[PDB]
């Protein structure tokens with residue numbers, strides 16, 4: 065198990081249970097926001113952490129409910145944070161589902177903050193406008209969970225990774241497909257992008273130039289991940305394939321995380337996911353140095369031993385040793401906690417320089 069700069073439980077089972085991590089880096093602020101579901105999916109909680117590089121440490125402030133990120137009589141789940149670098153606005157997207165839980169009753173929601181997460185606007189229900197008629201051909205959908213993406217296209221578009229359970233045939237159960245919600249006017253209007261392929265679930269997206277490419281990395285029902293690419297900013301994921309090197313454990317997979325960061329030499333991808341093909345154990349990191357080539361995915365390196373599940377990655381700028389710094393949040397010990405991990409490219413992939 066890799067040398068890391070920090071390893072700290074930031075949420076743990078107590079009065080409540082914590083699952084579904086999301087992580088947001090705020091560059092100008094040397095700060096991180098760690099989100100999770102608080103469950104009896106009830107509510108969403110937040111912890112802010114200040115990153116002090118000379119001490120190689122993030123200090124986490126107190127846990128707080130994001131009071132506004134809720135609908136009456138609904139449970140809130142699947143936090144997807146995004147920072148709009150053009151507007152200084154913080155977005156938190158999420159799913160609202162009736163308390164009493166065939167017919168779609170799932171709601172799409174956003175709250176915003178302009179004081180870096182300290183306070184929040186009241187929720188906007190994006191459901192009808194964002195989805196339209198399709199709403200009726202699904203039994204449910206989700207967003208994320210985890211960080212979303214803002215492109216460096218002209219409009220600085222927002223990309224919110226998602227999936228839908230489609231009612232495609234009357235005899236078959238609903239079938240899941242990944243897709244993205246897109247906005248070009250900074251989250252005032254939303255469009256639903258086209259689906260990727262049958263039997264994909266929780267996904268995340270990253271941008272790479274090498275000419276703009278949205279890469280999407282999706283959970284599968286199969287033994288490997290599904291990776292897909294858009295050249296039109298996430299409207300169509302034209303190519304799609306299984307990635308045998310990125311394994312998926314029994315019943316039906318695990319959520320994992322993908323980010324891009326600057327090439328030490330334009331971008332490389334980092335991906336986290338459990339690495340036992342047999343179970344949700346042994347959080348590994350994988351590097352794609354010639355992205356998005358599926359065959360360029362590396363062997364995993366080991367970040368955490370034992371029982372690990374969902375994760376969320378953030379690029380945090382330059383690490384004290386000069387190489388890309390990464391922060392990571394994942395579910396651990398049979399969901400008894402969510403661990404924050406911070407480490408650098410030099411620490412994890414010493415052989416691909418620093």
Ligand SMILES: *[C@]1(C(=O)O)O[C@@H]([C@H](O)[C@H](O)CO)[C@H](NC(C)=O)[C@@H](O)[C@H]1F
Pocket residue numbers: 084141142206265266317318319
């Ligand atoms: C994960 C999990 O596998 O552990 O799965 C999600 C869904 O059950 C999965 O995508 C299959 O439908 C859960 N999401 C929601 C919206 O409930 C996660 O909470 C988690 F359970």
